[PDB]
């Protein structure tokens, strides 16, 4: 379930990272290599609560020869702005939506405790900006 | 009838139902004044537009009538919708103030583009949405005619709405010089211009005074063909093009370097000079660029729209009452 900002730091240098914060926040800055996901809006939630599409499926479109290697070929990390106690996350929160959708595809995701806000205490060098 | 509470914001006096609270002057203009609020009876930050002097003229009375009818009609996630419309007036005689309520939509495509650089998925999601409501709007046999970034509202969840139907930079060539041969496809030219901006952060046809506007356009799509030229209107318009040095169509693949191939193909289909060759909203929805998002069952259409009133010519008294009628026959959404 939950990982620590430190574990991710090291885990990083050599895993798929999903950012489920608001798109403009994601574009302002995200953990290097982090991939963004639109899920909270009506259309997204809907089509998700209908199998029309699924998170893992979505992010499987950034390749050139094979669209899955490096994708489900690594553990999946997931993070939001700051959720400290992931265990308790409302069904509306983007964090909830992703986790349910990935878990629904037989995938065990790992949530970064304290989201991006935490990870920036001593990891600013592991982030993209503007 | 609810309970209103008067108050004065920036020299105009606002009289609104108890449920709307924390009115904050966001601005004004010709159209009227608008306050940002909070609707306790819904939890939504909302926008209240105070329409004053809606009947100080026939042109105005009708205009006020039109906007209201049109607004009451649209019911689509990607189109501006009326959450409420009210009047403190109790009698058609004490009537001369109209207030329109809608979700306060923060930001606009203009602000977004000038602030940050979006990912291809963002561009794709944003444009998918424009097309979705454009399909809806066209269903009701309505042309937007003034589609531009500043008319596109986007919230934090990247949801977008089209609002009230520089402007020259997105106007389509046909309706450019003023020819009576335009149609719904005229909005697709705009979406193409917009998509191009999303993809490059640069205005595609920033023309000075629309002469060059046409030059800039031609400079990209190329000077008309042999029959294509014989597919147009105007006297002047016709001559100018021939009066110009024949330019060849550019290959968008070189203009939009490093851009998603399916994108430039779509643009290739929208930024077409022959409006009869220009792709439709419905058709664009199906293009491979929207694969992950295309769901025919999730792309509604409107019901016909009675533009009949448009023809008739009436007097302030008529239009005014006709408006009170709409104001009263209003059924809130749920």
Number of domains of chain B: 2
CATH architecture group name of chain A: 3-Layer(aba) Sandwich
Question: From the helix content, strand content and strand pairing of chain A, which structural class follows?
Answer: alpha/beta
Binned strand content of chain B: 5-15%
Named CATH topology of the largest domain in chain B: Transferase(Phosphotransferase), domain 1
Query: What characteristic shape of chain B results from the CA principal axes?
Result: globular
Total beta-strand segments of chain B: 11
Strand-and-helix sequence of chain A, N→C?
EHEHEHHEHEH
Biggest interface pair, counts: A-B, 19 and 19 residues
Give the strand order, joined by hyphens, for the main sheet of chain B: 5-6-7-9-8
Q: Please give the radius of gyration of chain A in angstroms.
A: 14 Å
Assembly type: heterodimer
Report the major sheet of chain A: 5 strands, parallel
Structural class based on helices, strands and sheet pairing of chain B: alpha+beta
Radius of gyration of chain B: 22 Å
* β-sheet strand percentage of chain A: 5-15%
CATH level-four homologous superfamily name of chain A: Rhodanese-like domain
SSE run of chain B:
EEEEEEEHEEHHEEHHHHHHH
Main location (chain A): cytoplasm
GO molecular function, one term (chain A): MAP kinase phosphatase activity
Subunit structure (chain A): Monomer. Interacts with MAPK14.
Region (Interaction with MAP kinases) (chain A): 42-58
Describe this protein with a few key phrases.
heterodimer, A: 130 residues, alpha/beta, Oxidized Rhodanese, domain 1, five-stranded parallel beta sheet, 6 helices, 5 strands, 31% helix, 12% strand, B: 334 residues, alpha+beta, Phosphorylase Kinase, domain 1, two-stranded antiparallel sheet, transferase/hydrolase, Kinase/Rhodanese-like domain, docking interaction
């Amino acid at each position: 379930k939950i990982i620590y900002p430190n574990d991710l730091a090291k885990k990083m240098t050599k895993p798929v990272i999903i950012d489920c914060r608001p798109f403009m926040e994601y574009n302002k800055s995200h953990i290097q290599g982090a991939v963004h996901i639109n899920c909270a809006d009506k259309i997204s939630r809907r089509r998700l609560q209908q199998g029309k599409i699924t998170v893992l499926d979505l992010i499987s479109c950034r390749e050139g020869k094979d669209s899955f290697k490096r994708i489900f070929s690594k553990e999946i990390i997931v993070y939001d702005e700051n959720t400290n106690e992931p265990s308790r996350v409302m069904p509306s929160q983007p964090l909830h939506i992703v986790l349910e959708s990935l878990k629904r595809e037989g995938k065990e995701p790992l949530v970064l405790k304290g989201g991006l806000s935490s990870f920036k205490q001593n990891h600013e060098n592991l982030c993209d900006n503007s | 009838r609810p309970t209103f509470y008067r108050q004065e914001l920036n020299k105009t006096i606002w009289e609104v139902p108890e449920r709307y609270q924390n009115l904050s002057p966001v601005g004004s203009g010709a159209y009227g004044s608008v306050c940002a609020a909070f609707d306790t009876k819904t939890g939504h930050r909302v926008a209240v537009k105070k329409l004053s002097r809606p009947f100080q003229s026939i042109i105005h009375a009708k205009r006020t009538y039109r906007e209201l009818r049109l607004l009451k009609h649209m019911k689509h996630e990607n189109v501006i919708g009326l959450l409420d419309v009210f009047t403190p007036a109790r009698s058609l005689e004490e009537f001369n103030d109209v207030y329109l309520v809608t979700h306060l939509m923060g930001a606009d495509l203009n602000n977004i583009v000038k602030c940050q650089k979006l990912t291809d998925d963002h561009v794709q999601f944003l444009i998918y949405q424009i097309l979705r409501g454009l399909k809806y709007i066209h269903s009701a046999d309505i042309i937007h005619r003034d589609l531009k970034p500043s008319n596109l509202a986007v919230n934090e969840d990247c949801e977008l709405k089209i609002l009230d139907f520089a402007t020259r930079w997105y106007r389509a060539p046909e309706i450019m010089l003023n020819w009576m041969h335009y149609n719904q496809t005229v909005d697709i030219w705009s979406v193409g211009c917009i998509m191009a901006e999303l993809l490059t952060g640069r205005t595609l046809f920033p023309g000075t005074d629309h002469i060059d506007q046409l030059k800039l356009i031609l400079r990209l799509v190329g000077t008309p063909g042999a029959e294509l030229l014989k597919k147009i209107s105007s006297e002047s318009a016709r001559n100018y093009i021939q009066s110009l040095a024949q330019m060849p169509k550019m290959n968008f693949a070189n203009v939009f370097i490093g851009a998603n191939p399916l994108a430039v193909d779509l643009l290739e289909k929208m930024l077409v000079l022959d409006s009869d060759k220009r792709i439709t909203a419905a058709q664009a929805l199906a293009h491979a660029y929207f694969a992950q998002y295309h769901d025919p069952d999730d792309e509604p259409v409107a019901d016909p729209y009675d533009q009949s009133f448009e023809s008739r010519d009436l007097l302030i008294d008529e239009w005014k009452s006709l408006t009170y009628d709409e104001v009263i026959s209003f059924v809130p959404p749920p």
